[PDB]
């Protein structure tokens, strides 16, 4: 039936075959499940890569719908997970048998980096003592906020960023299941602006399809507000080729015409600053100045002065690069 859902939740990989990228990790987890050798897992990686979807597909594969509420204990950062919960419901769930059917139980701890260190220290002997009865899956974005004692007990899988070559067919499946007219440059802009994230590629696809009705390069870069590659090349050419006043006028006209933001301009100019074969003394100064300009934009600071400083960081090094020869 038709449902009113966001496309990041309407199109969720309910099975392990619907995830795209981490084929070796998913093959190893599938062979863990099929041989009943599932250990305590530690899924870590950047957001939007499919860790919660992986553990929910594994839990739906392991357990039927008539027994899913008694075998799976799913706790996350929206739940209270203090040390009284580790000593309370989690220990009682781990230390007791099942109700309906005999089997091993699963305690999913989503956002395990949000737990306090007291709870993580209390979890160690709960994990180690009841390995036969229950299994634990810790999922985090930052591995440093998990204590090394819990990192030793759980085998860790790095759910790295999704490569855009493998991100395309899932987006094509979502497009063909939603009747969306998309061009090749629209798909390329989607997998460029996503940057290893399938949430942001679905959100941007749904937002562009609602705003314009078609998904092309211009529509995606207009709905997102991101500058194009040609605009960044023009900004760099103006900052390296002419004086302060003409470059300031041209960049100000380009920003007023297309409604660009200085954060995305700074990000793309930072990406361009390493491809350009600059001297090493020039690159250090440019990176320090651009990091300072990016830091100044985090508060109530006028963006026009920061645009002038972004021009100034290159107008300083123009004559240095030229006289270097």
């Amino acid at each position: 039936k038709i449902r009113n859902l966001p496309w990041v939740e309407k199109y969720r990989p309910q099975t392990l075959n619907d995830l795209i990228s981490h084929q070796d990790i998913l093959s190893t987890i599938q062979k863990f499940i099929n041989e009943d050798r599932l250990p305590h897992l530690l899924l870590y990686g950047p957001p939007g890569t499919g860790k919660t979807s992986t553990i929910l597909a594994c839990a739906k594969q392991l357990y039927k719908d008539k027994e899913f509420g008694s075998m799976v204990l799913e706790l996350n950062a929206s739940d209270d997970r203090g040390i009284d919960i580790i000593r309370g419901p989690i220990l009682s769930f781990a230390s007791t048998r099942t109700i309906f059917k005999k089997g091993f139980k699963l305690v999913i701890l989503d956002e395990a980096d949000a737990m306090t260190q007291d709870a993580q220290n209390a979890l160690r002997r709960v994990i180690e003592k009841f390995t036969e009865n229950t299994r634990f899956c810790l999922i985090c974005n930052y591995l440093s906020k998990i204590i090394p004692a819990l990192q030793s007990r759980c085998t860790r899988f790095r759910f790295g960023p999704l490569t855009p070559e493998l991100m395309v067919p899932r987006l094509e499946h979502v497009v063909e299941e939603e009747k969306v007219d998309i061009s090749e440059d629209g798909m390329k802009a989607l997998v460029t602006l996503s940057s290893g994230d399938m949430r942001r590629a679905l959100n941007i696809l749904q937002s562009t399809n609602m705003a314009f009705g078609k998904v092309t390069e211009e529509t995606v870069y207009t709905c997102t507000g991101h500058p194009l590659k040609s605009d960044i090349a023009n900004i760099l050419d103006w900052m390296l080729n002419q004086d302060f006043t003409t470059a300031y006028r041209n960049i100000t006209e380009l920003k007023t015409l297309k409604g660009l933001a200085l954060h995305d301009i700074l990000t793309e100019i930072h990406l361009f600053v390493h491809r350009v074969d600059f001297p090493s003394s020039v690159r250090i100064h440019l990176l320090t100045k651009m990091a300072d300009i990016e830091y100044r934009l985090s508060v109530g600071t006028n963006e026009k002065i920061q645009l002038s400083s972004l021009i100034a960081a290159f107008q300083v090094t123009r004559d240095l690069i030229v006289a270097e020869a």
């Binding site: 790295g160 990176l287 990091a291």
Partner: protein, 174 residues
Amino acid sequence: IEPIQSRCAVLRYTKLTDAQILTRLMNVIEKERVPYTDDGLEAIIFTAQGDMRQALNNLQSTFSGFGFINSENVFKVCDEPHPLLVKEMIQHCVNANIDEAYKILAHLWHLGYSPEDIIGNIFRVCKTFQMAEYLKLEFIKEIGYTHMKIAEGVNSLLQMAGLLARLCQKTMAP
């Protein structure tokens, strides 16, 4: 506390060597009939980093996922350690070589590591790095100044590149 340590004999365990891990892993392999090669067990010892739990977990994961222990089967599921490359990028920052340091930083960024984990490994390497003491203190102060910005909300590749540029500037400015 000090009275409890005075009331007991304080035995201290050190990290297990590669031969000590290898002996127990060969015992587990001969008990489990795991086919293997020498580079695979070398990769397991490399990914264990003195941890027998991680050695057994990585061996069981590789044997369940692939059924054979070579280097690429281990590294398709396991991961190389972070400080082994963070030490190289800090060494590149000591010699004011910003290009190789940014190459290692971008390699760690494309692997999905958050800025907090990267700057934690950078501080961990710089705490015990072998260099001048005053330069080490300047490095640690610049790491803390960057980490305040990382914790306050701004955490991009430009901020880490600016941190690397400031670390390379600290060398050339006595």
